[PDB]
Amino acid sequence: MRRLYHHGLSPAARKVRVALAEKRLDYEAVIEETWIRNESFLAMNPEGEVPVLVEADGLTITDGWAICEYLEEVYPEPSLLGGPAAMRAEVRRLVAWFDRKFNREVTEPLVREKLLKRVISGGAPDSRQIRAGRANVHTHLRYISWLIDRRRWLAGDMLTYADITAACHLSLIDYAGDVPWEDHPQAKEWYALVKSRPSFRPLLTETISPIRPPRHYADLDF
Amino acid sequence: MRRLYHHGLSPAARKVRVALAEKRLDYEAVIEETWIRNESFLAMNPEGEVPVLVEADGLTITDGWAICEYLEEVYPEPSLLGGPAAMRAEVRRLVAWFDRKFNREVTEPLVREKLLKRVISAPDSRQIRAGRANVHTHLRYISWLIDRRRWLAGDMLTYADITAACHLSLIDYAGDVPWEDHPQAKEWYALVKSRPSFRPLLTETISPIRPPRHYADLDF
């Protein structure tokens, strides 16, 4: 049956999991710990990253963006890009905002230092990287608050890959306990709406050993 | 006429310039040096990056990838993604290979240390040697792909070839591509660089850096 190679620390893989659920597509979730070399996995994806989607006929789609665009092409409804070219471009802009800018400024340092290092032998957290990530998340939350104060969802009138991408990144910052939610109440409210959707539920209930998420992480009413 | 905000040190902007030309879309190239703060540019693109495409009617498309997907949706022929879902997915896989992996391993350190630092104002030699070592791995992969396909993603030129060639064109501007170790990849790069869509990348300069002698040479 359709399968997704993933791991809980990957924002892109989280995004694909949420997308598959939003599209009502059944799949088998298969963990690959990409920090442990596996020649068979590399043979399937030479980049050695998750996510990788394998359809029941064996068709193998690699890269989060490639998978997301493939899902919209093959399983068009419900749409996660929207209809007019201009709207789709705004969705894609915001996808890039989070998968590049937020990712580089916040997700990469906090996930690496607070989550991945504890999962592997990795060693001492780098406090400098952590402080920068913690400071930078404020600018992003202010932007989210600005967008959602004037739009229904981050990219406009319907939930899209923009909301999914932003929420999946934030979910990992939240797993680490580093989101200053109460400084950004409009962003907090938007995240509560996303986190309460059935597509988000596995991200809330699953854990990544040996890190215990914070007590509010799975609270819909946080 | 549509306008593209770009600069020569941006692989994403280079890619869009090539794409626009491949699709026979005229445009005005407008330089924005994004290392110099400009509130008006930020007001148009809050990320403060190039590329940004502005259509004649004012429609503003931001982000290289968003621009490429937009161009294929609005100007479908000639296609730079291809037709079947599987092919399009392979193109997008390779676009990511270059815009993520090659970019992190090779373009970022070499452009930063050798090009950007000279444009603004000491190169880190360790980072330069890491970039130079890693480009070999990527060229071997290119060579593997084009030994069995005409172009990186299959039988037709796509965003995959454009993205790879645009990244490599910046490495080549810095003089750091070991072409003599990778003759199959070299031959593929010569074909892409020779296309009319690539011409401005070859002839334009980024002050104060001079490119190597062969950089603009089709017969290198």
Side-chain angles (χ1 to χ4, degrees), chain A residues 1-36 38-76 78-127 129-130 132-156 158-211 213-222, chain B residues 1-36 38-117 119-120 122-209 211-212 214-218 220:
Chain A
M1 70 175 290
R2 178 182 300 113
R3 166 192 288 215
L4 184 74
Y5 292 86
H6 83 104
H7 65 72
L9 295 186
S10 168
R14 289 187 172 222
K15 161 162 65 177
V16 175
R17 294 187 77 179
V18 174
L20 282 166
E22 284 292 324
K23 288 186 170 277
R24 276 68 173 189
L25 303 173
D26 297 325
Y27 72 99
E28 178 181 7
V30 181
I31 301 165
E32 180 71 17
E33 305 185 317
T34 48
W35 50 94
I36 297 171
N38 171 358
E39 296 272 15
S40 292
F41 183 85
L42 276 176
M44 175 179 64
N45 180 13
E47 202 187 348
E49 306 274 17
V50 293
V52 179
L53 180 71
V54 187
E55 295 279 31
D57 70 356
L59 178 68
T60 299
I61 315 296
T62 296
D63 174 68
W65 289 2
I67 294 164
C68 288
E69 296 289 336
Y70 167 85
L71 296 174
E72 187 83 354
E73 287 170 15
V74 177
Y75 309 101
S79 178
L80 292 173
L81 280 168
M87 170 165 186
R88 294 157 72 90
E90 176 64 9
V91 174
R92 294 195 182 100
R93 181 186 74 79
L94 283 166
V95 169
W97 179 277
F98 287 95
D99 280 337
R100 173 167 57 245
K101 189 184 165 70
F102 186 109
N103 183 61
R104 291 292 294 277
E105 293 178 357
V106 183
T107 313
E108 277 187 354
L110 292 171
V111 171
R112 185 187 54 245
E113 300 305 322
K114 297 188 70 170
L115 301 182
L116 181 62
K117 277 205 218 192
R118 293 185 50 187
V119 172
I120 77 197
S121 305
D126 177 334
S127 293
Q129 293 269 327
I130 290 166
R134 284 169 56 79
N136 286 339
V137 75
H138 285 275
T139 312
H140 293 275
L141 290 160
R142 290 200 297 277
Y143 188 43
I144 291 173
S145 294
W146 183 267
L147 298 171
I148 203 68
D149 192 36
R150 59 172 55 211
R151 299 170 177 189
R152 187 185 191 53
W153 292 101
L154 289 185
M158 50 181 274
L159 182 135
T160 63
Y161 282 126
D163 304 273
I164 294 169
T165 305
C168 284
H169 272 94
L170 281 164
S171 74
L172 280 158
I173 312 318
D174 201 42
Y175 197 105
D178 286 317
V179 190
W181 292 117
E182 295 286 10
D183 290 327
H184 300 95
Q186 298 158 307
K188 187 187 165 183
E189 283 321 295
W190 158 86
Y191 183 76
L193 289 176
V194 177
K195 87 177 290 189
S196 290
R197 302 177 66 89
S199 57
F200 224 74
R201 188 184 263 94
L203 283 57
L204 302 185
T205 62
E206 297 178 11
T207 55
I208 299 126
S209 176
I211 303 106
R215 67 185 298 103
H216 71 269
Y217 179 75
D219 189 359
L220 302 193
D221 298 311
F222 82 109
Chain B
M1 160 184 273
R2 75 186 46 88
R3 314 171 73 102
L4 183 75
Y5 293 84
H6 82 101
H7 62 75
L9 294 187
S10 168
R14 287 189 169 223
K15 162 159 65 175
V16 174
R17 292 185 79 179
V18 175
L20 282 165
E22 284 290 322
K23 288 185 171 278
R24 290 166 187 95
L25 303 172
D26 293 324
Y27 69 99
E28 176 184 5
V30 182
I31 300 166
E32 179 72 22
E33 307 185 318
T34 50
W35 50 95
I36 295 171
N38 177 359
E39 298 268 34
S40 293
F41 183 81
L42 276 176
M44 177 180 63
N45 180 9
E47 201 187 348
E49 305 273 16
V50 292
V52 180
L53 177 72
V54 187
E55 296 277 30
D57 74 351
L59 180 66
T60 298
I61 313 297
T62 295
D63 174 72
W65 168 61
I67 294 164
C68 289
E69 296 288 347
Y70 167 83
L71 297 174
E72 188 83 354
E73 284 173 14
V74 179
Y75 307 104
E77 297 295 321
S79 182
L80 295 172
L81 282 167
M87 165 71 154
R88 295 157 71 85
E90 177 67 3
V91 173
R92 292 193 181 102
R93 180 186 73 84
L94 285 165
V95 165
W97 178 281
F98 290 93
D99 279 340
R100 177 167 54 245
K101 189 183 169 69
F102 188 106
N103 184 65
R104 187 184 33 238
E105 294 178 356
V106 181
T107 314
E108 277 189 352
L110 290 174
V111 170
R112 182 186 58 244
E113 299 305 322
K114 297 190 69 171
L115 301 181
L116 182 61
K117 276 206 218 191
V119 171
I120 75 198
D124 178 333
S125 295
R126 282 169 201 83
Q127 294 178 331
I128 286 165
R129 297 187 315 263
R132 287 161 163 285
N134 286 334
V135 76
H136 280 103
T137 309
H138 285 94
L139 291 160
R140 291 199 298 277
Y141 187 46
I142 291 173
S143 293
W144 180 262
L145 295 170
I146 63 169
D147 198 44
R148 57 175 61 222
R149 300 166 176 188
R150 187 177 290 299
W151 295 105
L152 291 185
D155 276 309
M156 54 178 268
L157 182 136
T158 64
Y159 285 125
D161 305 275
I162 295 166
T163 303
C166 285
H167 272 98
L168 278 162
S169 74
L170 280 157
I171 309 319
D172 198 44
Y173 196 102
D176 286 317
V177 190
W179 294 115
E180 299 86 354
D181 295 312
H182 306 277
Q184 298 162 304
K186 184 189 165 177
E187 184 185 20
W188 158 87
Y189 182 78
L191 287 178
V192 181
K193 85 176 292 186
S194 290
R195 299 176 68 91
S197 58
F198 223 80
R199 183 69 158 207
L201 285 58
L202 297 188
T203 61
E204 298 176 10
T205 55
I206 300 127
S207 179
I209 302 106
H214 70 265
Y215 176 79
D217 189 6
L218 301 194
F220 83 110

